[PDB]
């Protein structure tokens with residue numbers, strides 16, 4: 001009773017039916033942090049894909065990013081774009097932002113662990129949002 | 144419209160009424176990972192204080208810790224204690240595990256950001272659990 005079972009690890013996200021693929025809440029690179037703050041508190045989601053003018057995912061903005069902004073010693077207000085979080089980290093260029101439905105659970109779990117991130121955005125061939133896979137999604141499938 | 148407002152940052156957790164102080168789900172240092180996995184999926188909480196034989200908090204076990212276990216290349220099963228997560232990180236010795244009600248939001252936010260952790264356990268003078276403060280708790284108060 002290996003954990004995880006090898007047969008699970010070799011299956012794809014699509015095969016295991018892992019992730020959320022409807023009603024995804026997301027923002028734009030030009031969205032102010034106040035908009036994200038309001039979504040997090042009132043809509044109750046943990047992270048928001050951030051898309052460019054073409055609809056392509058370039059970041060994911062999380063509750064922790066807001067707290068990190070709050071801790072900055074320099075003066076900020078909430079009118080700053082969510083892209084200021086990119087000064088702290090680049091999920092995009094580290095290859096720990098996106099995934100595809102055909103990737104295996106082994107690949108997804110290793111990518112999450114590589115950068116200690118808690119979700120990935122599932123995208124299409126144009127880097128447009130199809131869904132989100134979070135640690136909760138993976139745990140549900142493991143049981 | 145500084146973010147966060149300085150008057151918020153100077154107030155304590157108790158003053159701002161931030162955190163969960165009832166119905167805290169928690170485990171022991173001798174608890175197997177399978178028990179934690181079942182709590183995470185069925186009880187739907189994000190992290191679990193881990194307490195020793197005296198009831199004192201010595202770690203906090205999170206969904207990410209399970210995923211980190213899953214990614215280990217060595218052979219594991221779920222009968223291993225939750226304390227195996229301590230091979231990867233020590234929240235305790237880094238001083239990023241616990242907090243007190245009288246600490247300021249500035250102190251709490253800086254401690255969360257220091258180690259990039261998403262919650263702290265609120266404890267008493269004996270390191271026994273009183274509650275949990277997570278990023279969601281802090282955001283609710285910021286709005």
Ligand SMILES: Nc1ncnc2c1ncn2[C@@H]1O[C@H](COP(=O)(O)O)[C@@H](O)[C@H]1O
Pocket residue numbers: 019020022023024025026045046047048049118119132133134135136137
């Ligand atoms: N931006 C989002 N929009 C919709 N669902 C989301 C979003 N972020 C996470 N989820 C889903 O919310 C559930 C809980 O995720 P987690 O908050 O990370 O515990 C999972 O099924 C995620 O796939």
Ligand SMILES: Nc1ncnc2c1ncn2[C@@H]1O[C@H](COP(=O)(O)O)[C@@H](O)[C@H]1O
Pocket residue numbers: 162163165166167168169188189190191192261262275276277278279280
């Ligand atoms: N082990 C736990 N038992 C009870 N409440 C918890 C626990 N962990 C987190 N919470 C609370 O669950 C809510 C959502 O936290 P978060 O999952 O981190 O978004 C917050 O009000 C936390 O204080």
